[PDB]
Amino acid sequence: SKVFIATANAGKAHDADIFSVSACNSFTVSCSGDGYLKVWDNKLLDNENPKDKSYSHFVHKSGLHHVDVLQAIERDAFELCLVATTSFSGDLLFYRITREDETKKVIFEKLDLLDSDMKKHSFWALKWGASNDRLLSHRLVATDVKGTTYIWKFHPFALNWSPTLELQGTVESPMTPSQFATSVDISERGLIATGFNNGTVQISELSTLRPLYNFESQHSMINNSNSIRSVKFSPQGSLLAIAHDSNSFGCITLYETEFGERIGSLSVPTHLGEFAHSSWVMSLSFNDSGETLCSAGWDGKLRFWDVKTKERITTLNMHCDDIEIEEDILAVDEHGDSLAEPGVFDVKFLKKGWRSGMGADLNESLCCVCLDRSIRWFREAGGK
Amino acid sequence: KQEESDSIEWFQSALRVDPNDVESWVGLGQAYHACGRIEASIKVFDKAIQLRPSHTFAQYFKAISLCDVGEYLESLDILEKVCQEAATEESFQIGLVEVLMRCSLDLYSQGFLLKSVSIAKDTIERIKIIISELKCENQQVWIYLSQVLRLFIWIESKVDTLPVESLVSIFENSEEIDSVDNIKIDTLLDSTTDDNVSIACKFLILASKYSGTVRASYWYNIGISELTAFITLKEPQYRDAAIFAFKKSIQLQSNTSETWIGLGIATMDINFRVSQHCFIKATALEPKATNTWFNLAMLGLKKKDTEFAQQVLNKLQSLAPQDSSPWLGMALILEEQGDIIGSSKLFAHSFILSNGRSKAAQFMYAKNVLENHINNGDDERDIETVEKLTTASIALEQFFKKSPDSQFALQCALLTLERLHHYENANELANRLIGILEKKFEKTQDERELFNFAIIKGQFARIHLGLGNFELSIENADLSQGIISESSDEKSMKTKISNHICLGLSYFFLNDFDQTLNQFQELLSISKDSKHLVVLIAKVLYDVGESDTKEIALQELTEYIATSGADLLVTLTIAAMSILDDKREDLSIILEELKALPLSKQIIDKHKDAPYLIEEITKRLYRNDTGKQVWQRSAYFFPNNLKVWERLDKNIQRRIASNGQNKVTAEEMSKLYCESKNLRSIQRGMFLCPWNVTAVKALNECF
Amino acid sequence: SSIQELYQSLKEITNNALFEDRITKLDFEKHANDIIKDRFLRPSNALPWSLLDMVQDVPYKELLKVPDPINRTSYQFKRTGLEGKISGYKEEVANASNSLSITRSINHNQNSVRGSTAQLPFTPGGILLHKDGQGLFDIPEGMNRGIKPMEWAHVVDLIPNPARSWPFELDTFQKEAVYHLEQGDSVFVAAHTSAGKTVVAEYAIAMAHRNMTKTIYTSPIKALSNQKFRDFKETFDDVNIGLITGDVQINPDANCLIMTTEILRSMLYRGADLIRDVEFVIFDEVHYVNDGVVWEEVIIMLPQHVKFILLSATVPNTYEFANWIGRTKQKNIYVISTPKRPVPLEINIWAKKELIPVINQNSEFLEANFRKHKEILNDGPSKKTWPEIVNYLRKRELLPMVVFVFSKKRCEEYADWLEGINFCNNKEKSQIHMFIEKSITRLKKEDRDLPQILKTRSLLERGIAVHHGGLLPIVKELIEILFSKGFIKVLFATETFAMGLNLPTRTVIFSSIRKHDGNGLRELTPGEFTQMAGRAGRRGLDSTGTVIVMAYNSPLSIATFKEVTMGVPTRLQSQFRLTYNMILNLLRIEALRVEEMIKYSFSE
Amino acid sequence: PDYEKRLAVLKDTEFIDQNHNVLLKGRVACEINSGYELVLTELILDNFLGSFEPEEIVALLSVFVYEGKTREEEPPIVTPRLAKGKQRIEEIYKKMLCVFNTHQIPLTQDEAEFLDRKRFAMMNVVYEWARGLSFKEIMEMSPEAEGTVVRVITWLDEICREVKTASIIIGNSTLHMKMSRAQELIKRDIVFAASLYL
RNA sequence: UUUU
């Protein structure tokens, strides 16, 4: 991944901050603080505004900050697409996405999968675990404000549609008193990683739900900075990338999950020390092959790293004037503050063939949401 | 006929005539491999496998090629499947062992020291299986075993994992040099009082003896193993055996550089002329090797000839600028001479170039960083110093994985972790150090070790004080004070002061025996007088609450002020004490004092504690007078200060810290977002710091 | 109220039946002693560095590197019988910084594409100290003291299972080149531009792909690399191609890699592992001569398993260079030359609104027509001459036309004199607008609004464009693509546009026959004119190629006209040079001494 | 004879010794692949560039990539350190010309007229591009066309790479960090836009 | 006053 070309964008897509983004083969999902959920069609034609092929639905008045989509072919012909979101109030909501036969419009259907006793908790993070030959049932993992990780199993059928969520168990925080669980991830090999606000990461086994490792990524414990913002597993390898703060700096550390030992860190010279970004790292993403890592920075840059050599490859700069339609450009916010270099909230790699359009048919894509309330799409030059 | 390049065209023509010949594809791939065309051979083997999936040798050749290009996972899977399909073939098993060993060595070189030992154990298990079942013996498998056994000696923190059960059966299912080393299987089995590392090295020297080019290689391998044992254990018989083996190997061929390098290494101290001649011969044999020059430099340095070492290191730097050894040698030379800045720069360059592959680079970098920042008078707000300490701590953590139980490195790491507030790792490190010292002093039955014992106990008490174990801290402080009380030297006063501080603070915090704390702090004040020490003692005495304690604290603070002059910290502490004690005359005097500080005393006060104190005193003496004028003056002098704009305008404060003008943390930035009292900004600030109470409370209070 | 209570209070927020930016009801604004006590009079468990400064005190065999073991035994496979299958094995009896061999070990840490100076190169293809005292050495080499303790080229006159097939019937020279490549050696083709030299390169790439090897395509101009990359992307199926630049690498593990000559030379001098699998290196535009052209050094430095395919224009010095290469590298190379052009070219002179032919199809000069020209006339273009010629060619349907002007300013000046002439319909204008809009979507609004882009867009939407070296590369690429699409009718170009590029044109017009290069005005050499005037006919869509040389109120000299239009063509010249970087690298490598490299050269 | 004279010049400047062994200066000059290796090697060998900023160093190195065949009056320099570096480079080049003329080596047209052309006329443009100005303002203040500026910056990228490697060889880490920062700073926008054929 |  060396050359990235912008293919489409949509400024002023949402009315508030777009905190997360997710993609599937059919569409891309965005959640914002205004309480809406927008579905963007991935199969665009030449000379088509992205906002023309978009559909929105209102979920919660308090806004949404996490989103994940699960798409799979559950039977010979049955197809299910599920969207899970969590709100600022702490509610976990599930929606089924389907399309009309004639108009081809997207329909939203709300699902009820949590019992009354399960609705008393405040969830923060979530992640869909799809079937990857590890076990025949899909998985859902979430964290709460008390530090506990929950694991479920989703059963679509009881072909008869009757979804049901079955709780497998819970994993508690490794330290007393409990801390805030800020991020969570699940791998294809059956591992769960959880990040905490004190800088501690815990890894537990999916099958038996018992802790394995407890490594501490803090540079120094002089101050109470250095919380964990993002934890990501490598798609095929035994590698775990950690994004953590360092007293106004952003750091990335690499660990190997077979034995849990520190491998190294990614850093570049910035206006000394070992820091990857100037402000903070808010998101991380691996490509399909697991050889390139993308970090979204609060400073307004997308940096691409070589995993094996731990060296930077290229940098993408974000500007408010990159929006095609000039009437959608948001130069200043509601307080007159500049947005010429807006920070990135989330970044996502799209698989080959997911996103079609201006030459993006045979190579990997990329999507990001920024502070100017915009959503942007890129494509990798060349083919594969 | 081994004329591989000549058959490429013939195989290509035969393949053009018939594109479905599997043997033509196999021959073309095996010809490409010997011509350095590894990727083309990989593709050819893939093609042949696609034609005939049941072909067996094609998968083995593909696995070897994948190992050559460095793809260990796919080759390991292929070879495991092949060995499962047919376990009778010896070549397949040997190739699997080879790939396992190469993968382990590559992981070791790449820094994956925890999986290297596991793969080495797997390789040893496979070798045991081969020897026990197939009853097949060859030189290659023993060389592979010896290469694997070096991983356990190199990674000494994981030496207890060595499979001593499989190795016994490996050495029980199969004389000139035996009289020197006396290393035998029977002597190995009937041994006692032998350390783990010694047994590891003795196991290393049995695969070399259980395996004229071939004989020369055999004797050179035995000599290399004995040289490794001599370096690791420092016993003369290993040196004699190594020299004997090197002499025999030289008498066999005498046309290889490595034998001369080994002979020069084994005779470094017995005679320097012999080592010089050996290194010159080795350099003349192979001029493209940069190790001989470094060995000659080290030999010259061991004889205290600095000019020769400097010249050879200059030549070596001209030769191999990317290697980290010449920089280490130059740094050592400059440290011996007396230059300090250049030595630090060279140590840093060596550490950066090493990339974790050198223990010595890590150790010298950590020692230099500790030396340069032990009494430098620097604060904890300097990013560069804290980052240097963090890098030194990481380097020492990497160092302890290969060579643990080192006293000097353990003490340096203890000091670094004390500076870094990592009180949990320091506890384990100090436990290991105490155990090592106790083991060392319980054998020689000496008494000179009691001096370092007291210092280690004092450090261990400080670690407990930091962790919060007041009882153990008091016990260790008492032990250290008792062990050394009549001594009068430079290293005793520091330990005495540290023990007094630990005792007083530990009693005050939990024991509530304020009389003992008062006695110890009085003794400390009698023994020393420094600004920070007297300020800490005054704060502790004030926190006690006794009227006599407060009087003593104020009196000794004023005495220090009279003796050493005026300082901002002491004045601020006195002002705080007066404000908490409600002394109107003292408050007015301090308000007169605080409002006329020199500019030097205002540039230093980066957190504007003084203006806050002036505002607090002003509002507590003149009803409700507005004291914002000091904030306006401070903003006039310091418009780019984050603290001054808090009292004047939060918009300016949010804007200034927004885009990198000042360095602001996530909690502070989240506080700035929420203070605009807007739904979007409140959501932003709660997303940044979800555990903040004010953010969630404001979001709840919105609607 | 801890965080748990606050988060429990949040769940009471019930959804009701547009977004509104709400304002909180919380008020952010004598317990002031708690802050003072916590800030100025709070003892702590963690001792600051000030106290550690007072209570803390700081407290050759292992620096060596023992040589690694050695293994001299290996395995050999002995097949048996017809259709050889592995029957038995027997036990029978070097890094990048030590050996020059191709069989040295591969280190996976370094780049396999670029390399490093820490690696020695591979062996190029086809190219006392004992101061003993009492029996033992004491003086190392290079010092004054010890330790004091203290093979031919052939000319050809003009496959059962071909690796590539084409619909049309191949030319004789194409068939000869394909046959000689199939036989397994080198070729050296010298033919006119747009005569079908790309067929040879395509067949070479297909042959390499069949044999599971790789190909390298080099050109001395970086502008041609992108065009060739797009062309081979569109042409080729089942084979992947890549592009290597100074910084960007696209598909590094591709069968075909396109780069420049300097990148290949830098790769060669640093021993990149890429050359291990490379079978062909193709040298295009060999005839190019400018005072980046370092292809001879590449020829010298290449390994011995690499073959050569060299594509060039018609020059009379081919055999000398072919023989030099064959003798130097011990390679068999064949020389194929063809003067045939698919579209005949006719030379005309424009004078007094009249086209007067002076050289017919058979390259025969016409003295009577030149005399007619000279007498009819009895100096540069004016503000009313270009529209007249444009209308004249529109009346006779002689578009598209290309005018070559050898100055940046005069091209733009001439294009502005065509105001009031339009060549596009409504649909054509809409399509051009759409393409321009879709091309510049990767830039910012500030970049999209540059005056050059606006001016070019104004010109492009009428069928008129200008091509010269002072434009932005994106503007030049847009102009070239739009011209290839067939939308542009009138174009003013410099010599940049006369090199290997797609150029469908029906008429070529020369503003002048004098070019100012270096120091001093100079009349065009026959090679420059032949290359520039040789692009005036489209194969299969045009019958003849019209070439017009313009005279403005003054007759053209017959001597200069004959010298430029019909004269002895230019010859190939050697551009080999000596540089301090070259000598220093050779001295550092300590192999292939500089004298040997110099003596193995065309000049010597 | 040209090779012998070049060897004599290399030995006279302490790049090699009497035995033709490559010295430290000769090792650094092996990595520079522009047309002026010796001048750049002696510019970066000592600690002259210690006080400079990354923008100042990247703007100063543009003399080695700009042909200088313009026809306008140069504007005054933007920073004093750029003028100091210009003086240093001119003095080094005068000394090199003296050395070359001592051994009677035939020079090229560009080497002979290095100081007779306006090769320092693009320092301001490169400095302002590194600072972060837009291309419209850069073109408004430039004395050349768009293609010339694009070519100059594209070549300065490779110059920065070479200086990174040379600084790694020398033993200077501050120069390495400054070169990395400058390389990140200059690579942006329309100058380094993706090709329309990709 | 082209090419880079």
Swiss-Prot record, chain A:
The keyword Metal-binding does not apply. The keyword Cell membrane does not apply. Keywords: Antiviral defense, Chromosome, Cytoplasm, Meiosis, Nucleus, Repeat, WD repeat. Pfam families: WD40 (PF00400). It comes from the Eukaryota. PROSITE patterns: WD_REPEATS_1 (PS00678), WD_REPEATS_2 (PS50082), WD_REPEATS_REGION (PS50294). One of its GO terms (biological process) is nuclear-transcribed mRNA catabolic process. One of its GO terms (cellular component) is nuclear chromosome. Component of the SKI complex composed of at least SKI2, SKI3 and SKI8. The SKI complex interacts with SKI7, which makes the link between the SKI complex and the exosome in order to perform mRNA degradation. Involved in double-strand break (DSB) formation during meiotic recombination through stabilization of SPO11 association with meiotic chromosome and helping SPO11 to recruit other DSB proteins like REC102 and REC104 to meiotic chromosomes. Also a component of the SKI complex involved in 3'-mRNA degradation pathway. Represses dsRNA virus propagation by specifically blocking translation of viral mRNAs, perhaps recognizing the absence of CAP or poly(A). Essential for controlling the propagation of M double-stranded RNA (dsRNA) and thus for preventing virus-induced cytopathology. PANTHER family: SUPERKILLER COMPLEX PROTEIN 8 (PTHR44090:SF1), WD REPEAT-CONTAINING PROTEIN 61 (PTHR44090). Present with 1710 molecules/cell in log phase SD medium. This is Antiviral protein SKI8.
From Swiss-Prot, chain B:
It is found in: Cytoplasm; Nucleus. TPR repeats lie at residues 1-21, 22-55, 216-256, 258-289, 497-530. Transmembrane segments: none annotated. Belongs to the SKI3 family. Component of the SKI complex composed of at least SKI2, SKI3 and SKI8. The SKI complex interacts with SKI7, which makes the link between the SKI complex and the exosome in order to perform mRNA degradation. Present with 11900 molecules/cell in log phase SD medium. Component of the SKI complex involved in 3'-mRNA degradation pathway. Represses dsRNA virus propagation by specifically blocking translation of viral mRNAs, perhaps recognizing the absence of CAP or poly(A). Essential for cell growth only in the presence of M1 replicon. This is Superkiller protein 3. The chain holds residues 715 to 1432 of 1432 of the full protein.
UniProtKB/Swiss-Prot annotation, chain D:
It is found in: Cytoplasm. It comes from the Eukaryota. Belongs to the helicase family. SKI2 subfamily. RNA helicase component of the SKI complex involved in 3'-mRNA degradation pathway. Represses dsRNA virus propagation by specifically blocking translation of viral mRNAs, perhaps recognizing the absence of CAP or poly(A). Essential for cell growth only in the presence of M1 replicon. Component of the SKI complex composed of at least SKI2, SKI3 and SKI8. The SKI complex interacts with SKI7, which makes the link between the SKI complex and the exosome in order to perform mRNA degradation. Present with 5770 molecules/cell in log phase SD medium. This is Antiviral helicase SKI2. The lineage of its organism: Eukaryota, Fungi, Dikarya, Ascomycota, Saccharomycotina. The gene is SKI2. The chain holds residues 1090 to 1287 of 1287 of the full protein.
